[PDB]
Amino acid sequence: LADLERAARDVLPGEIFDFLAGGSGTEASLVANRTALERVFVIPRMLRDLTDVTTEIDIFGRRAALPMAVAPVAYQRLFHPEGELAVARAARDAGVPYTICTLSSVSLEEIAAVGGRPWFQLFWLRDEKRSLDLVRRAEDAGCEAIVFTVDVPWMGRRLRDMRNGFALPEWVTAANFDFAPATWESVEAVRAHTDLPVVLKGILAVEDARRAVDAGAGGIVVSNHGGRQLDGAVPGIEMLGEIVAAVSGGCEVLVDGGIRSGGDVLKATALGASAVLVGRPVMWALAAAGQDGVRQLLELLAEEVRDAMGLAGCESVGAARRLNTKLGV
Amino acid sequence: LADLERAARDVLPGEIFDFLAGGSGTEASLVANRTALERVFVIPRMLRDLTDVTTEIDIFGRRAALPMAVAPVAYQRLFHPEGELAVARAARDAGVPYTICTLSSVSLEEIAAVGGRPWFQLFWLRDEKRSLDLVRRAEDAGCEAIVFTVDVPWMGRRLRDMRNGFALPEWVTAANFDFAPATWESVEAVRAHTDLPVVLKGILAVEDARRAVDAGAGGIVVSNHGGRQLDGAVPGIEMLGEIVAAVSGGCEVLVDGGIRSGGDVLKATALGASAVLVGRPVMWALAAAGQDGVRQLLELLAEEVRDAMGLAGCESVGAARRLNTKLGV
Amino acid sequence: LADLERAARDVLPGEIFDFLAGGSGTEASLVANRTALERVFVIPRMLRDLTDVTTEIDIFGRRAALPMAVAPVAYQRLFHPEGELAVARAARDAGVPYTICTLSSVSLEEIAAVGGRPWFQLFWLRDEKRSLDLVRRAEDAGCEAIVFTVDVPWMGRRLRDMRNGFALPEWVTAANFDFAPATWESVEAVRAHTDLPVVLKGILAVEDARRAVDAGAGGIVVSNHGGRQLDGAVPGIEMLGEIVAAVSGGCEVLVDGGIRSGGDVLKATALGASAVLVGRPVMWALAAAGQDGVRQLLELLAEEVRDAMGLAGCESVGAARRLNTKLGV
Amino acid sequence: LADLERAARDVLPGEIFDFLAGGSGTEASLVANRTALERVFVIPRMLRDLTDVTTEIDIFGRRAALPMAVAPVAYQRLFHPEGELAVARAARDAGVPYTICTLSSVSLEEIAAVGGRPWFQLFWLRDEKRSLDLVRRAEDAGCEAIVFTVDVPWMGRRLRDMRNGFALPEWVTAANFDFAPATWESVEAVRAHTDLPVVLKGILAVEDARRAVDAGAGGIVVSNHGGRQLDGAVPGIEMLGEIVAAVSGGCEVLVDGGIRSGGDVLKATALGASAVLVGRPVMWALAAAGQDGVRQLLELLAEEVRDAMGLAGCESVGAARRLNTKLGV
Ligand SMILES: Cc1cc2c(cc1C)N(C[C@H](O)[C@H](O)[C@H](O)COP(=O)(O)O)C1=NC(=O)NC(=O)[C@]1(OO)N2
Ligand SMILES: Cc1cc2c(cc1C)N(C[C@H](O)[C@H](O)[C@H](O)COP(=O)(O)O)C1=NC(=O)NC(=O)[C@]1(OO)N2
Ligand SMILES: Cc1cc2c(cc1C)N(C[C@H](O)[C@H](O)[C@H](O)COP(=O)(O)O)C1=NC(=O)NC(=O)[C@]1(OO)N2
Ligand SMILES: Cc1cc2c(cc1C)N(C[C@H](O)[C@H](O)[C@H](O)COP(=O)(O)O)C1=NC(=O)NC(=O)[C@]1(OO)N2
């Protein structure tokens, strides 16, 4: 995956690339997501039957080809003319869920029409009733899950964007339109307004994970927002195992932040994740070769996950979740 | 804050800058203050009401705009012609306490007259009665607290200053005048001579913190003197949580050493500090733009603290003190 | 040993060298084998009788001159015209066992005829009966042990070899011929087909080690395959002490991965290993000076082991196994 | 102390300097002595009476000006024409014990005649009776202690000296003459032959320290021989606290390895050492300015120890031994 980031830097406007790659503050949490994953070592199992190694999972009542979904990333036409439609098509063809962003540069109904059963990421707005209508739009459009982003009461300070003066070009729009901090009351409002599973994205505290289950969430994403919100927030991968134990199967526990390979997916699943989100790498593939580049990234990731699982002695993702790990230096 | 240190290095005499930036010996403790803060990760809380995020604290019976005060730094006219008056004015306007140094290049009565209710840092002198008169002067002048510096029985060996031959220029004076090691007896002498809270600055041992409370101190500053006294002294941030537990609310527990951002203030408060002191960065802003530069530093710090608190789910500094942390590598 | 790797890089084709030196993926496990050994510190014992320091061990009923054997490395004619015969001769003369590889560039019967009682590494094939005939060939040829490689259900992804397009030259053959994942059933099939001790190579999980003893294995090699299989697999040296305790003498426990000196052998034995395997360094000596270069490597290693043991106060390898260690940074 | 090492490198023959500076093998233990000290942080005490800060200790019935002695270093005329007489004179004038080496380039009776009550380091020889006569010579000459070196059954492999071909020049002699591994029997032979305290140098195992007390030793030096014997031996400073607790005052516990400052002496004493040995820095001062250079090094070290103790709140070395420490990264 390191290959295509080189290709993405060359073709992208230098300040668009930094909007994609950057974190908040000193980017301590952005770097820590990677160091956290690199400290994790897997204890593989040997000599088990690998007749039918399968990377498939069931999540929110639907099968997925991989323990993975495309993370919500706003304004995907910043990276390629086809934007979200290109990514959604490749995700659909790969059997991987795709999270439609509230700030998508193509309307959510259009992305949903691509099929491949997508998810919708909600930013709490203005008034409750606009937010809830956005939820209803997503559900009417056949979205399968509401990914409620809970770690953005406001945008963290991106020192890359203040020093770049970066601003939305004229050709990139918030196609869903023509904000406010979310609370547990907002979560209950969404939950009461939809039959779709509500997935809280940006959970890092063990008791926030427990309360998420109590609040009726169908899932959480253990995430420090790719190091883009609180600078110095603990990496999600560092809280994952604790959160998995506290939740005790009460909801799906996803994780994101620095997933760069099938080996990283294996590490995440061995720490207990149901699935991972992948953000920045999907955008590199988009900016370097559009829908075909995304589809190839997903193919390579699919192959790496399958390879890592077999070398670890895991015929299923469930077996991968039962692997032990050891922390290194 | 890294921006202005560049600006301060350019305008300051190279040996004045090193007097400001340096530590003792190999500067192991100076570096360790920063590494200690960078190892601390905050576990943010989500979805809490942030209607009225306030960074204000009460300390020594008075409200402060931020959990922060300006640290005592001697001879501030070494950095800018207006010296302590410039810093005291900006601190007052920012709602932040200002510690008048015993070795101030402007008399303490003048700095106190600026208003904004200041603190006085005491170096134990010569004879008890000169030290106590200095205390009485500070109290007569309306100073709010005596910050008794307890970690300087004598100056640590600054290898930057011996190799520079650095000495006070002719235009910088100890305006309060026309020393000796402090003991617990000296502390009791001060305490008996003043109704002001006595704050012991330079406490690193848990039992020194307990004894400080027993001795009647109103506060302590957990501090290795910015790495300028004992080289190899533990960083204050590394002892803070232990000291907070041992004191059990018996006095205010401040910390200093390497605070460079609002995120660092959040980390300090999450470890249990009542407030932080900020030293070197305040002098950079002073040397780069005088009173206006200090005021802007305090404004930026105030904004960073507010941002960090909200992203961490803390509406008040008290909630920030209840945040959990996790140590990284 | 660092000297000759320089010599091996100069004379080897740059892509043959990388086939030898490389790991899978990001080579995180290849590097970790070395960092794991470098973190280990030995607590030497003083003032013990060193009259007859001996580095000899008994393993699989036979004496060996050193707690060491040559690791299975395929296609040794890739490194020198005499290939496996050169290494086998030097190993025999050094009193060190030599593991014949299933993919040897010289038939196993020829290598076995060199004498010095060798071992045979088995890759599970195609059909059970071809694999078992290969086992019978090895036993008929006087091989002393079947080293069943259990961590290669398939080859890990060598990013050095995909980026090199590396492929077997025309002059290098799989001389034993004219594959499939191994399971515990395959292990039982081998065990039932031979009176030779079966040694499972590639065990990293404590319960795989216990099951190996239960399955009738005569030994295991605690190994992540030199970092060439699962990228991110824990280093064998990091699991060695735990595995030794769990096995409780039930079988021989060997270790490999990054052994580069007699000091490393001492560390391995102090962690509890019966013996180590040495792979890449033996090939460097082969590519730099053929049989004479291998013999000199084994002589230097033999001297370093003897020196390290004496400085540690160990007259025998058994005493070296009772040494304590301490982990550093 | 870093200043004079620069001066020593310039004036010394490049291969003489490496004989002085080098360790065995990869020099992992040489480096680890320094990293071990740098990880140690002292928790200073405040506000204690420092009326009469004294760095003096009693050891082996005699007062010393500092918790320090000059370590045995062979062939001191390799570094300066006056050799051991220059160092012994400065040590005497500094009130610091001086260890006469068995391989001194000036006879032990001459060094002893300098006065300042010296120690004698014994290498076990040839036959018991030559070793015991060397002991008797030292005692007849007024030496105060026999420092029995127990970690050299033979010389560790100095890779700097094999690659230099370094050999004794014609002008440097083993003036005490005209070897064998030491055992606990050798220790008892010495102990029975002398009324002087026997000090075992090179103890790293806790049970070797306990046995040393049982064997009647008056002291031990916790030491990995400056990283020159077993490469990968644990640093002495890493075993010091454990060894101090196990010995429970039963003998003096000294430590050496990487002591480069008064702060390092403080760290050693806070970990429980009675005193430190200093080796390489004393030779740098000798090679850079002879007796006057050594005397100045001892003066600077004496000042640094006094400074560090006062900043740590210690009026005596005994108080310094009761300081707590904390390990860093
Ligand atoms: C450019 C960009 C935009 C967004 C995000 C991340 C990047 C880099 N993210 C974070 C991702 O969803 C993943 O959490 C993270 O990227 C995983 O890390 P990796 O890139 O290392 O795989 C968003 N999350 C939301 O919920 N809503 C959004 O609008 C979103 O933030 O405003 N837009
Ligand atoms: C130049 C200078 C002068 C002083 C101090 C620090 C510097 C850098 N300090 C230490 C500061 O008060 C903070 O403890 C430290 O600076 C926090 O670290 P940060 O700079 O990283 O924020 C002093 N403390 C006293 O009590 N009395 C003094 O006269 C004082 O020392 O002699 N003069
Ligand atoms: C080029 C090469 C080929 C093989 C192996 C290793 C290298 C480098 N290895 C791994 C070694 O046996 C050691 O485990 C490892 O090299 C120890 O690490 P060190 O080099 O640092 O000493 C093999 N193992 C098998 O069982 N069968 C094989 O065919 C084998 O793999 O396909 N061929
Ligand atoms: C050149 C040299 C020679 C000797 C020693 C050390 C050096 C560097 N040493 C080790 C020192 O006594 C200290 O243990 C070590 O130097 C402390 O470390 P520091 O240099 O960092 O302070 C010896 N020890 C003995 O017992 N007998 C000897 O003949 C001795 O070894 O053969 N000659």
Coordinates of C-alpha atoms in Angstrom, one line a residue, chain C residues 85-210:
Chain C
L85 CA 27.7 -31.0 -0.1
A86 CA 30.0 -28.2 0.9
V87 CA 27.9 -27.3 4.0
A88 CA 27.3 -30.9 5.0
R89 CA 31.0 -31.7 4.9
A90 CA 31.9 -28.8 7.1
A91 CA 29.0 -29.5 9.5
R92 CA 30.1 -33.1 9.8
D93 CA 33.7 -32.1 10.5
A94 CA 32.5 -29.6 13.0
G95 CA 30.4 -32.2 14.9
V96 CA 27.3 -30.1 14.1
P97 CA 24.1 -31.7 12.7
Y98 CA 23.0 -30.6 9.2
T99 CA 19.4 -30.3 8.1
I100 CA 18.8 -31.6 4.6
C101 CA 16.1 -29.4 2.9
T102 CA 13.2 -30.9 0.9
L103 CA 14.1 -28.4 -1.8
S104 CA 17.9 -29.2 -1.8
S105 CA 19.8 -28.6 -5.0
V106 CA 21.5 -32.0 -4.4
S107 CA 19.6 -35.2 -3.6
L108 CA 19.2 -36.1 0.0
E109 CA 20.9 -39.5 -0.4
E110 CA 24.0 -37.8 -1.6
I111 CA 24.1 -35.3 1.3
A112 CA 23.4 -38.1 3.7
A113 CA 26.3 -40.1 2.3
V114 CA 28.7 -37.3 3.4
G115 CA 28.0 -38.8 6.8
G116 CA 28.1 -36.7 10.0
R117 CA 24.6 -38.0 10.7
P118 CA 22.2 -35.4 9.1
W119 CA 18.5 -34.4 9.6
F120 CA 15.8 -34.1 7.0
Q121 CA 13.4 -31.2 6.7
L122 CA 10.0 -32.2 5.3
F123 CA 7.6 -30.0 3.4
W124 CA 4.2 -31.7 3.2
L125 CA 3.4 -32.5 -0.4
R126 CA 0.6 -33.1 -2.8
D127 CA -0.5 -36.5 -1.4
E128 CA 0.2 -38.2 1.9
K129 CA 2.0 -41.1 0.2
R130 CA 4.6 -39.0 -1.6
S131 CA 5.4 -37.1 1.6
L132 CA 5.7 -40.4 3.5
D133 CA 8.0 -41.9 0.8
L134 CA 10.2 -38.8 1.2
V135 CA 10.3 -39.6 4.9
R136 CA 11.2 -43.2 4.2
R137 CA 13.9 -42.1 1.8
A138 CA 15.4 -39.9 4.5
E139 CA 15.3 -42.7 7.0
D140 CA 16.7 -45.3 4.6
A141 CA 19.5 -42.8 3.9
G142 CA 20.5 -42.7 7.6
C143 CA 19.0 -39.3 8.5
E144 CA 18.6 -39.0 12.2
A145 CA 15.5 -36.8 12.5
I146 CA 12.5 -35.6 10.5
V147 CA 12.3 -31.8 10.9
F148 CA 8.6 -31.3 9.9
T149 CA 8.2 -27.7 8.8
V150 CA 4.7 -26.7 10.1
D151 CA 4.6 -22.9 9.5
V152 CA 4.5 -23.1 5.7
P153 CA 0.9 -24.0 4.6
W154 CA 2.1 -21.8 1.7
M155 CA 5.0 -19.3 1.2
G156 CA 4.7 -16.0 2.8
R157 CA 4.7 -13.0 0.5
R158 CA 8.4 -11.9 0.0
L159 CA 8.2 -8.3 -1.2
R160 CA 11.9 -8.5 -2.1
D161 CA 11.2 -11.4 -4.6
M162 CA 8.1 -9.9 -6.2
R163 CA 9.9 -6.6 -6.8
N164 CA 12.9 -8.5 -8.1
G165 CA 11.0 -10.9 -10.3
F166 CA 13.4 -13.5 -8.8
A167 CA 13.1 -17.0 -10.2
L168 CA 15.2 -20.1 -10.0
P169 CA 18.1 -20.1 -12.5
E170 CA 18.3 -23.0 -15.0
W171 CA 21.3 -24.5 -13.2
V172 CA 19.5 -24.9 -9.8
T173 CA 17.2 -27.9 -9.5
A174 CA 15.0 -29.5 -6.8
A175 CA 17.2 -32.6 -6.9
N176 CA 14.9 -34.6 -4.6
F177 CA 12.1 -34.6 -7.2
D178 CA 11.6 -35.5 -10.9
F179 CA 2.7 -29.1 -2.0
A180 CA -0.1 -28.8 0.6
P181 CA -0.7 -27.4 4.1
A182 CA 0.3 -29.7 6.9
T183 CA -2.1 -30.4 9.8
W184 CA -1.9 -32.4 13.0
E185 CA -3.2 -35.3 11.0
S186 CA -0.1 -35.0 8.7
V187 CA 2.1 -35.0 11.8
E188 CA 0.5 -38.2 13.1
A189 CA 1.0 -39.8 9.6
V190 CA 4.7 -39.0 9.7
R191 CA 5.0 -40.1 13.3
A192 CA 3.4 -43.4 12.5
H193 CA 5.6 -43.9 9.5
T194 CA 9.0 -43.5 11.1
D195 CA 11.0 -44.5 14.1
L196 CA 13.0 -41.3 13.8
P197 CA 12.2 -38.4 16.2
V198 CA 9.9 -35.9 14.6
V199 CA 10.7 -32.2 15.2
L200 CA 8.1 -29.6 14.4
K201 CA 9.7 -26.5 13.0
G202 CA 7.8 -23.2 13.3
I203 CA 6.1 -23.5 16.7
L204 CA 5.3 -20.1 18.3
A205 CA 2.1 -20.7 20.5
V206 CA 2.5 -22.2 23.9
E207 CA -0.4 -24.6 23.3
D208 CA 1.1 -25.7 20.0
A209 CA 4.2 -26.6 21.9
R210 CA 2.2 -28.6 24.4

